[PDB]
Design a protein around this motif. Structure first.
Motif, PDB file in Angstrom:
ATOM      1  N   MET A  38       4.561   4.599  10.811  1.00 39.89           N
ATOM      2  CA  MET A  38       4.904   3.165  10.531  1.00 39.89           C
ATOM      3  C   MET A  38       6.050   2.793   9.840  1.00 39.89           C
ATOM      4  O   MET A  38       6.846   2.280  10.331  1.00 39.89           O
ATOM      5  CB  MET A  38       3.704   2.473   9.643  1.00 39.89           C
ATOM      6  CG  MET A  38       2.544   1.879  10.616  1.00 39.89           C
ATOM      7  SD  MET A  38       3.112   0.789  11.839  1.00 39.89           S
ATOM      8  CE  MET A  38       4.207  -0.519  11.302  1.00 39.89           C
TER       9      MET A  38
ATOM     10  N   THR B 255      -1.105  -0.758   6.339  1.00 43.23           N
ATOM     11  CA  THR B 255      -0.328  -1.364   7.478  1.00 43.23           C
ATOM     12  C   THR B 255      -0.732  -0.694   8.734  1.00 43.23           C
ATOM     13  O   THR B 255      -0.758  -1.373   9.602  1.00 43.23           O
ATOM     14  CB  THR B 255       1.059  -1.141   7.074  1.00 43.23           C
ATOM     15  OG1 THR B 255       1.684  -1.527   5.737  1.00 43.23           O
ATOM     16  CG2 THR B 255       2.131  -1.763   8.040  1.00 43.23           C
ATOM     17  N   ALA B 256      -1.098   0.460   8.911  1.00 41.46           N
ATOM     18  CA  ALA B 256      -1.479   1.283  10.042  1.00 41.46           C
ATOM     19  C   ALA B 256      -2.807   0.887  10.488  1.00 41.46           C
ATOM     20  O   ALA B 256      -2.941   0.529  11.704  1.00 41.46           O
ATOM     21  CB  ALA B 256      -1.409   2.685   9.901  1.00 41.46           C
ATOM     22  N   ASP B 257      -3.698   0.642   9.541  1.00 41.75           N
ATOM     23  CA  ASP B 257      -4.871  -0.070   9.697  1.00 41.75           C
ATOM     24  C   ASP B 257      -4.738  -1.519  10.573  1.00 41.75           C
ATOM     25  O   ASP B 257      -5.489  -1.809  11.387  1.00 41.75           O
ATOM     26  CB  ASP B 257      -5.759  -0.295   8.436  1.00 41.75           C
ATOM     27  CG  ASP B 257      -6.367   1.145   8.513  1.00 41.75           C
ATOM     28  OD1 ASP B 257      -6.575   1.977   9.251  1.00 41.75           O
ATOM     29  OD2 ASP B 257      -7.046   1.410   7.215  1.00 41.75           O
TER      30      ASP B 257
ATOM     31  N   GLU C 201      -2.371  -2.882  11.976  1.00 37.07           N
ATOM     32  CA  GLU C 201      -1.456  -2.738  13.107  1.00 37.07           C
ATOM     33  C   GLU C 201      -2.477  -2.294  14.127  1.00 37.07           C
ATOM     34  O   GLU C 201      -2.138  -2.912  15.299  1.00 37.07           O
ATOM     35  CB  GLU C 201      -0.189  -1.873  13.076  1.00 37.07           C
ATOM     36  CG  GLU C 201       0.880  -2.233  14.407  1.00 37.07           C
ATOM     37  CD  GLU C 201       0.923  -3.357  14.550  1.00 37.07           C
ATOM     38  OE1 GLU C 201       0.601  -3.915  15.654  1.00 37.07           O
ATOM     39  OE2 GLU C 201       1.510  -4.444  13.720  1.00 37.07           O
ATOM     40  N   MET C 202      -3.395  -1.375  14.040  1.00 39.19           N
ATOM     41  CA  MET C 202      -4.279  -0.740  14.921  1.00 39.19           C
ATOM     42  C   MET C 202      -5.283  -2.161  15.218  1.00 39.19           C
ATOM     43  O   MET C 202      -5.757  -2.423  16.493  1.00 39.19           O
ATOM     44  CB  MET C 202      -5.286  -0.043  14.283  1.00 39.19           C
ATOM     45  CG  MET C 202      -4.873   1.582  15.222  1.00 39.19           C
ATOM     46  SD  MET C 202      -5.258   1.427  16.815  1.00 39.19           S
ATOM     47  CE  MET C 202      -4.036   2.785  17.301  1.00 39.19           C
TER      48      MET C 202
ATOM     49  N   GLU D 286       3.316  -4.903  22.880  1.00 38.04           N
ATOM     50  CA  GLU D 286       2.797  -4.297  21.406  1.00 38.04           C
ATOM     51  C   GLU D 286       3.969  -4.222  20.499  1.00 38.04           C
ATOM     52  O   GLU D 286       3.932  -4.646  19.358  1.00 38.04           O
ATOM     53  CB  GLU D 286       2.085  -3.074  21.507  1.00 38.04           C
ATOM     54  CG  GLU D 286       2.022  -2.231  20.481  1.00 38.04           C
ATOM     55  CD  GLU D 286       1.211  -2.979  19.100  1.00 38.04           C
ATOM     56  OE1 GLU D 286       1.366  -2.294  18.228  1.00 38.04           O
ATOM     57  OE2 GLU D 286       0.515  -3.987  19.472  1.00 38.04           O
TER      58      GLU D 286
ATOM     59  N   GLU E 183      -4.625  -5.473  15.108  1.00 35.35           N
ATOM     60  CA  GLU E 183      -3.731  -6.682  15.685  1.00 35.35           C
ATOM     61  C   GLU E 183      -3.534  -5.948  17.241  1.00 35.35           C
ATOM     62  O   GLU E 183      -3.594  -7.011  18.211  1.00 35.35           O
ATOM     63  CB  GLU E 183      -2.074  -6.836  15.170  1.00 35.35           C
ATOM     64  CG  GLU E 183      -2.249  -7.271  13.882  1.00 35.35           C
ATOM     65  CD  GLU E 183      -2.733  -8.872  13.897  1.00 35.35           C
ATOM     66  OE1 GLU E 183      -2.384  -9.491  14.811  1.00 35.35           O
ATOM     67  OE2 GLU E 183      -2.974  -9.568  12.842  1.00 35.35           O
ATOM     68  N   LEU E 184      -3.448  -4.513  17.451  1.00 37.27           N
ATOM     69  CA  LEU E 184      -3.285  -4.150  18.711  1.00 37.27           C
ATOM     70  C   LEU E 184      -4.717  -4.277  19.622  1.00 37.27           C
ATOM     71  O   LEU E 184      -4.579  -5.030  20.796  1.00 37.27           O
ATOM     72  CB  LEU E 184      -2.960  -2.828  18.807  1.00 37.27           C
ATOM     73  CG  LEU E 184      -2.902  -1.749  20.164  1.00 37.27           C
ATOM     74  CD1 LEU E 184      -1.980  -2.396  21.067  1.00 37.27           C
ATOM     75  CD2 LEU E 184      -2.313  -0.652  19.802  1.00 37.27           C
TER      76      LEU E 184
ATOM     77  N   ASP F 258       0.633  -1.313  -0.007  1.00 38.82           N
ATOM     78  CA  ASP F 258       0.022   0.088   0.013  1.00 38.82           C
ATOM     79  C   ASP F 258       0.968   1.348   0.032  1.00 38.82           C
ATOM     80  O   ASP F 258       0.500   2.292  -0.689  1.00 38.82           O
ATOM     81  CB  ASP F 258      -1.039   0.167   1.110  1.00 38.82           C
ATOM     82  CG  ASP F 258      -0.306   0.141   2.468  1.00 38.82           C
ATOM     83  OD1 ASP F 258      -0.715   0.956   3.336  1.00 38.82           O
ATOM     84  OD2 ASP F 258       0.587  -0.898   2.940  1.00 38.82           O
TER      85      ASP F 258
END
Lengths: 390, 394, 389, 393, 392
Positions: free
Chosen positions: A173, C168-170, C172-173, B172, C175-176, A155
């Motif tokens: 990230m 990736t940010a989505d 990772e949120m 985390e 998974e957290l 992405d």
């Protein structure tokens, strides 16, 4: 940052996949405060060593620099660009050597199977961290997605390819994974055949050399090594290369390269990435354009008309943008013992190399102001067949 | 994730640093539903190939399994433990082969210069992700900080070593970075190419000399003739190539060198307990191999047979008192001609004895029993224990 | 996650809303390496206990397995799919029991009032974590938005329903927050004695210590004759008096318009089948009958019912699911049923003759060949013969 | 928080960029439970002090409130709205003073080079945290992006301007960075001593000359004499320093310059609507102050009184049709003696007329009515509306 | 990075709190490729202008450099160290001017009430980002907790003060927040035009009265004349404005008030060591300015000359033994005619004596020598050193 001169010297001449691709080996060397290592970018050209090899000459005669040999068989400008992103602060305001081989400029470009071997995750995350949202980032991301359609972090590479704005969360990230990779690669890349390669490549030929530097005395030993090792062919090639490539099925190699042309290539666009980064990092490169074995290029029927025209096209891309330091050896393909094989310099070729490269690197000079033309990224220039117009 | 049978066969017998330390090649082969690959853990045991080598016998005779050879020089239990962390679901409810050489049980233990080559960052993050905060996690962290005093993620390893609980932010960070490391490794590790030369010289060349119908005695005839031809330059039964390089010129000082050598005291006893714990958690059914030393060598070097069997007894107790009873013990077979390839490694006819215990075990797969783990095998008390092994608990 | 056999045995037969929807009861039992708990997916089928009930037979005769009973009234395939997301590792490469009742295949599908009781945030984040960006993730998200227009974490669900690849940010949120939920659920749901002794232990006392299908039948038939005695259609006394007796005139011909051939439940079933394929689970599917005397009185058509069964079976068999215990034609059998729609007494013995050999001899799942057209409206509304295909 | 009354009194009258733009100083004073500080929103209106100035009168006569002067030259409604985001709990259910000066309603709106000086990152992140995905947030983001096309956190501001919903990752970045910005601003900003000696030069100077007992006539007598002395060098009633620096060096030019000047078309009408929307959301009860221009100046410069009243009609419609009825309209008072300090600002005797509307309002805090917001006031149709205000809907 | 010479020239002579403490204005000037700005680090030294002021001379005679005046009243080495962290690349391989005044070296150190005004959140995050876990990072963090015990990110600063290593989670919070603060400061700090009117008041005013042709004698004439008018009321050498406000109204109480004032023991010696470590790390080539006190004042207040020269020796030893040897020492020039504007600051003719050392240094730029740092200069033993300086 911690340094060890011996490890760095062994890395510098290792000429392995790890010595090209992993951060630790090249960064430690190029950031060494005591000894000046100089990036020598190329492909297979550093792999074959003799008494006149840049690495051999610099060690024997204790020169003010040492070559760090960057490159492997099948690596071209796209691979080089990505490697540079791991070592940007070590390239800032410094001199380099950049070989531009005309045979890289085939119509399909570089080998995808070769690229895969030299690209890694540290290069991927360094690319994403150091992008400035320009044409270089846009073009490189597009090329990466042709190479790896299902790349890790798809992405983010896609966003760069389509010129989209990276989000704040995306940028965080990126910066986190990039830092981790640079922490990880710095630690784990110092434990990787150092000593055996040094004795085979460098120390074998130190014994053979005179203790006092003169071009004539080195030439005599080098010519004798060439005479003994071009012992089965009349075109002046190495005996080991001749038996492996041009012996079994040499008959089908007659007039094979009549249709071969290096005028139209995506490699011209790939080269522009390197020249863009050279401008941003203010590097002072010397460019080396090799010839082909002249007896081979009459047997295989490779056009000298075409070969000089590609050289002109390459030189125009360089010189019109401010890159004037060029060692053009392209017409020197018929010279005695100039070529190791068919496409690589060797023996007395390295002495010609030395006569242009050594005075440049012994007398360091700051880079001029460059004038980048972003129309060299286009498919127009890639498939350009004309002359000096634009 | 789709599987190529050709690439997996080359990885299985490559015995490079990459085939061992990298996630990609070993996970690709060990997760193939179409062909069964079996983890063969050891050190330099799988490096030298002959006609009776387990990789050769499986290929010619088209067995129900193929060995995946996992090991290089100097790799012992700490290395193996960390390598396992990359392939936990691929080991779950499965059979493995685990070599336990008594000479790894030196007073100083494993070679730190050797360890460095086989431990990557993917193993570090896999360790921190899959640790359960127990004695295994505390001990392995301690061994890591001994190995790398300035390790990556030193704060996280030190917390594990000091029995401290990790924080929510710490957890985390571990989970993110471990996932990133596994995605990175599985994508970028599939492009490693050094197989075709290594497959032919080690596996494909020994396929022609073997009979097309399987029998141990017929193979023994072909392997006997190879061994007689290649133990020419010496009269203590070692390979020609090995004798010239490691022993020939040093032969004068090597006499009575191992006169005070003892394998009873070692940190390798505590490192072995890491592996066994992982075997219990993952429910793997291992067969252990205990090799001999060349008897003609050990008589020359002064390596005590009374000590050597006393350490094997110490090894066997650690295994068997915890429920590990599949032990192919060859430690008394050192004086057998052509059982040995060199000083310490199985070879030739020794591979045939190896096969007689390993093949029937792997050809008929049975689930692992219930193990009863003893945590006192992690202690320094066990590490340096001299006496009667039946009197350890009191 | 610390195991206690007693607490997990009590959870397995609790048959509560909480023992279905909360992670720490089911996962603790299903992840115990000492004893084998088998998932028994259904709705209200497990609620009524007798001497032949699967949970009673397993305990009485100390079998190699114990049923974990999952579901209550109103819980259908969509509820089951979301609950599975909490126990994927515990379902991997294992055998399950899955009831498919044709009565769930109503034209409006499941009851939204019942769905809200069994769905939670732990199931939401578990689905967001384990989704693979396919047609299944796209369909389930679309259904979540149909059920809950202003659903929790709407931005992530909408992205899934639009079949967009997440950043990736989505990821990772997700998974957290999924990890937080599983750490939070697998602690605050550890907290069933009076249930166990009324449901299981009561029928343990009446059974023989020696196992025989004949001696258990005699004990169970006797209980059935005693407890279906206030009516003529073989229903349990308390059920008849509470649900049938008063409204007897009102119920005659009340189900003449009732048809199960067109339903969103066919699409919901396909989620469970897709999840079964991914996790390599080997299910036995159970198809119950309806009380024959009842379905004739209420005007519920038997040819419609069998055409529904045929449609369900085609959705199963054509994709590689062939373990089907089909009891749909057994609605007229003596003492086979507890009430109108649930298996009971001797029907539990017929349940057992199919289920017990399957579970006592575990076998790996075959390769399934999934058909994504089973997610469509065309299949949902399909009227014709499966003989056609 | 422990509250320093003296530092808060100094902050309130500091009339600096820091007192306006920084979180610490205004939040400290407006959250004090002991003394009541009231937000006085304007541009350069509070800059110049005399005996009748709101801050002077409240200090001399010890009123139940103190003005906290919010504003700087060039600050209009977009600026005030972003400053409000830093102090939302301190505006909740309370009274404010808000100046609406008709000359802010230029065809191109506010001066971008003035806005830049009064906006910070705290305001950026406060806005981002407190937005609710409505028409106000969307209009403010659009205007922020016109102002700063390469703003920090550009993507988030772009999403808001495009009416897109923010993700959890986006929201948690905002929550983190907004929290960091408020902690950082409230901790380090408490050490700022900017414009703390200005208390003597602007407030304490005029306490000596004023009578101890309150009397509008006695104050008028004191202030008118000061005005007479300080408007001596011209005949249009402007302060001597202002007239010399602005008007005197070329008037030739200044004559008939504002003939084609109009304030009926402006993006400032939509900018005002942001504030009005916030006033409704926070339930504030504002009193609006509409200043005139110097009538002698507006005759000389050719500033049409026809246009000016038509502008005030347009402003008043926007306020009143939505429920905002507390309006002190002084637009017809530009020809009154010593009503003006310069061309556009109230001063001297104009401050007493200001007080006669503001002091009764602030002394008895009445709750805000239920407003009836019209989102049509955000549109370009309203910003360019020329006709009579009655037939708009 | 965009450059505007007009703005940068006004920033350089603004002498504001903002021009010191904010990132944007200083790095924008000090990174301009076309015009060379030299960092002038001091306290109140640059505040009072005359015809011989460094910034006036450079603008009048169009020198090859321009002074960027860094500092405010009360700023000492701790303040300066934390300011440097915002501009590290801009200080790399560069000449600077660094005032070391002996009167800063009081027994308790700098005024915390002054420090607070020149420190911001960007300074905190730049400190945490650029620290290397060394003795300098340890000392600075200890000092920062003395100053701000309840500071934002207290736990991380305390980890540095206790020589503990920061966690991976800690590092990511630092990196992200530091990235945020620098993006924020560079973007919004460029719009500040504070003290931009001071260029016309402080620099352009004195360009008229100065001769077009440069000579130290012609400037001495104009500047002596300006000094004579503004020393009318008192015969101590002090300015009219300064004498009336600091000295006049309590003359009798100031008599013999500094009889036991000693600058020999001070935490400022350790604070200076931060700056010196940083100058070595960044390869800065500094010139150090040691001003005197007014001699008539120091005889009146009873300030010991023998103490004062002993502190100068201690400061000089800290510099010279480490390799810092460019010292413009004016510490014995206190009784020179019109050498001082103040009781403690150079002015008028002292600015010309300043110029004679500083101009030849900055007109011919030279790379810094290798330094030899001594971490003993961070310790409490060096801070409280009494004896002769050769023995240490």
């Amino acid at each position: 940052m911690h340094h060890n001169l011996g490890a760095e010297k062994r890395s510098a001449v290792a000429t392995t996949i790890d010595s090209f691709k992993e951060r630790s080996q090249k960064v430690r060397a190029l950031s060494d405060p005591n000894v000046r290592f100089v990036p020598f970018f190329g492909s297979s050209e550093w792999l074959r060593f003799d008494g006149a090899h840049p690495a051999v000459l610099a060690e024997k005669y204790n020169r003010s620099y040492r070559p760090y040999l960057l490159g492997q068989g099948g690596a071209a400008s796209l691979n080089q660009y990505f490697g540079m992103q791991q070592m940007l602060p070590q390239l800032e305001n410094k001199q380099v050597v950049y070989v531009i081989s005309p045979q890289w400029f085939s119509k399909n470009g570089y080998d995808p199977a070769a690229f895969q071997q030299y690209f890694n995750g540290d290069q991927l995350t360094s690319f994403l961290k150091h992008q400035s949202g320009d044409q270089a980032s846009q073009y490189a991301a597009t090329r990466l997605l042709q190479q790896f359609p299902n790349v890790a972090m798809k992405d983010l590479v896609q966003k760069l390819a389509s010129k989209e704005e990276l989000s704040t969360a995306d940028n965080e990230m990126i910066e986190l994974l990039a830092r981790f990779n640079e922490r990880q690669a710095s630690f784990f890349g110092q434990f990787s055949r150092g000593y055996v390669n040094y004795d085979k490549h460098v120390a074998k030929y130190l014994k053979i050399l005179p203790d006092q530097f003169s071009y004539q005395a080195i030439e005599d030993v080098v010519k004798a090594d060439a005479e003994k090792n071009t012992s089965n062919n009349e075109m002046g090639m190495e005996n080991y290369f001749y038996n492996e490539q041009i012996k079994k099925d040499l008959k089908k190699l007659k007039d094979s390269q009549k249709s071969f042309t290096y005028l139209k290539s995506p490699e011209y666009n790939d080269l522009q990435l390197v020249l863009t980064q050279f401008s941003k990092s203010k590097v002072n490169p010397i460019f080396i354009i090799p010839p082909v074995n002249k007896k081979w290029m009459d047997y295989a029927g490779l056009r000298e008309d075409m070969y000089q025209q590609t050289v002109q096209k390459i030189r125009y891309q360089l010189e019109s943008q401010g890159f004037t330091n060029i060692a053009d050896f392209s017409k020197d393909g018929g010279e005695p013992f100039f070529m190791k094989d068919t496409i690589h310099l060797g023996w007395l070729g390295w002495l010609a190399f030395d006569k242009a490269v050594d005075p440049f690197l012994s007398n360091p000079t700051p880079a001029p102001t460059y004038h980048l033309n972003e129309r060299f990224f286009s498919k127009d220039w890639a498939t350009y067949d004309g002359d000096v117009k634009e």
